[PDB]
């Protein structure tokens, strides 16, 4: 295989939380870069957009531990920590942090690997988790800044109920009841626009799929509303700057 | 080595961790057992006996966490969220727990990080609905509480009901009348709270029995001691003795 990689265009949909179990991670946000070795846990707001440079420590294992917080549960921290902590502008060293992880939370994390679908656990696990780390501060801050919903997450999510709909700005337009003008505009006061929030969610998804028991790219072209398996590696590719197939063996 | 202790009454939620004593529990005529390296977990407001054995002599029998109001009170806005919408419980502790009971003994005075630590140990309790449930519980307001409150404004004050009567601006009738709508009397009550500041007293510093008796509002000093005997089925000397 390759030790190293590089993928863009990531936006960031659900605040994330890394620990780059067998990979040192280098990060690039806008013209700034970032960087996590070893053993240790990233924190990256939701809606970051960014580079990564990924270079693994075994090529046998997977780089990294990705802890996706769906939106109920990151509200349930914000609103617990907000109680817990409180509310005492914001750039880089807001929006992605890093921590040393000492074996107390090396082993909290494992806890928080097997609770799949058990929210009530790891919420749980997370709320000390975060009371364990220095400068938890700028977390919480950052998870409030994580729970705004704006309307550009109203459009995603909706889309997102299936992306293999054959979405056009009409159809959204239509599911909003406002004229197909005022989506464009209010994208573009939130400064995107439809198609692209499209390409976005679906390469998302796309890449989701691959890393799973798998299926094949017609398959997953066709998941995601692309006609052309063909096609669609050569738009993942030109997305993230790989294609489908050497994403996956670097991940699978 | 051995004591037997009685009468024991819980005002704040309370969670043991058996480290090196045996204990069992005499709830109603129900006896229950905790092994050695065991959670305890105990509904405010219960009244037990237990009877304690140490292992190692040098060491107290076990860690006991007893919850005030601030932390009882976040946790129920919060456990609320993170669960959403059977009084005395025991479990087994393995290295993660046993690990964090360490972290939790540490968090002297950080009411954030124990709040914390707290809401994650009880998520990875079986049957923790129960002991959710407990904190549920626990958290209601009663009036018996209230009087608490205000025979504690000042315990060594001359307290009758007649003066209780006085402080609310009501009669002295309302005051025994809802307590019996709550199954419970002033004197007990009053017990309890010189009972609680006595025998928290005798633990804290080596004060004489004299100061503590001052300080419960007791004018003689051989009254307090036979009070607490009928009470706790062990003498002053021999509670000391035990627990330090």
Same mark, same amino acid.
């Given at each position: 295989e390759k030790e190293l990689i590089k993928i863009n265009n990531v936006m960031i949909h659900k605040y994330t939380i890394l620990y780059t179990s067998n990979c040192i991670l280098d990060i690039s946000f806008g013209e700034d870069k970032i960087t996590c070795f070893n053993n240790r846990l990233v924190f990256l707001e939701r809606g +970051? !957009?960014? @580079? +990564? %440079?990924?270079?693994?420590? /075994? #090529?046998?294992?997977?780089?990294? +531990?990705?802890? %996706? #917080?769906?939106? !109920?549960v990151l509200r349930h921290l914000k609103n617990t920590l907000m109680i817990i902590y409180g509310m005492s502008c914001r750039g880089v060293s807001r929006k992605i942090m890093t921590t040393e992880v000492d074996k107390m939370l090396l082993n909290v994390l494992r806890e928080m690997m097997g609770h799949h679908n058990d929210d009530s656990s790891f919420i749980s696990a997370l709320i000390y988790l975060i009371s364990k780390i220095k400068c938890n501060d700028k977390i919480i801050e950052s998870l409030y800044m994580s729970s705004i919903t704006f309307f550009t997450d109203k459009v995603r999510? +909706? &889309?997102? *109920?299936?992306? @293999?709909? /054959?979405?056009?700005?009409?159809?959204?337009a239509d599911v909003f009841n406002v004229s197909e &003008?005022?989506? %464009? *505009?209010?994208?573009? @006061?939130?400064?995107? !626009?439809?198609?692209?929030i499209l390409m976005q969610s679906r390469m998302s998804k796309?890449? #989701?799929? #691959?890393?799973?028991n798998s299926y094949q790219i017609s398959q997953i072209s066709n998941m995601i509303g692309i006609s052309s398996a063909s096609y669609f590696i %050569?738009?993942?590719?030109?997305?993230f700057g790989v294609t489908p197939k050497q994403f996956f063996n670097y991940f699978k």
């Open positions: +970051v !957009n960014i @580079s +990564v %440079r990924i270079q693994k420590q /075994k #090529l046998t294992e997977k780089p990294y +531990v990705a802890f %996706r #917080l769906n939106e !109920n999510g +909706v &889309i997102e *109920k299936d992306l @293999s709909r /054959k979405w056009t700005l009409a159809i959204i &003008i005022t989506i %464009r *505009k209010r994208l573009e @006061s939130e400064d995107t !626009n439809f198609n692209q796309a890449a #989701l799929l #691959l890393l799973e %050569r738009i993942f590719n030109k997305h």
